[PDB]
Design a protein around this nucleic acid. Structure first.
Length: 110
RNA sequence: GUGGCAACACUAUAAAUCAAAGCAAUUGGCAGCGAUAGAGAUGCGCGGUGGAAUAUGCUGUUUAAAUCGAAUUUACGCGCAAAAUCUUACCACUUUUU
């Protein structure tokens, strides 16, 4: 939970940096009330084993895998900072932790 | 040798061997020695087994092989959370390399 926690916080830092108005002077920001940090429970499944090597059918022990999940939400209107996001997650390597990413977006059709 | 009516009562050493025979406080194992605590620990209940058939495992018998270990509790739905060939180590036959 340590690594997924650091992953969630560092990508949250990246999002807030990525749309950050660093100076006033140009003034179309999206903190619209879609935005969340939804946490999630897991997939409860126990996988047990024989303790002993041979006869030993008394000898049971329970084992177990954990998957911890978060989803990170934002949206925006210009593409150059979206590319800053995708290249940002291209650079910073994260340990043991899967990144699956959903990018619903508008694109024009002939 | 003394006493007696005696059973024997004395007095009384040794020969010969052994390397310990012993003793007291313990520390542990016993209890067919009690007091206090705890366990469906019972007598308190329910449902089984052992009766029938099937599944399934084991012995024993035979077969060419029925591969091999598990053996009283704690082995017997055990290695096998899976054998139609393959898994598979066993046999029949035909080949292969040292």
């Amino acid at each position: 939970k340590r690594y997924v926690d650091m992953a969630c916080n560092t990508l949250g830092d990246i999002i807030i940096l990525a749309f950050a108005p660093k100076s006033y002077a140009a003034l179309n920001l999206a903190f619209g009330p879609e935005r969340r940090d939804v946490r999630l429970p897991w997939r409860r499944t126990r996988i047990t084993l024989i303790r002993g090597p041979h006869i030993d059918k008394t000898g049971m022990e329970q084992f177990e895998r954990r998957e911890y999940k978060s989803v990170l939400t934002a949206a925006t209107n210009c593409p150059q900072e979206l590319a800053r996001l995708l290249e940002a997650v291209k650079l910073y390597q994260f340990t043991g932790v899967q990144i699956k990413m959903q990018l619903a977006s508008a694109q024009r059709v002939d």
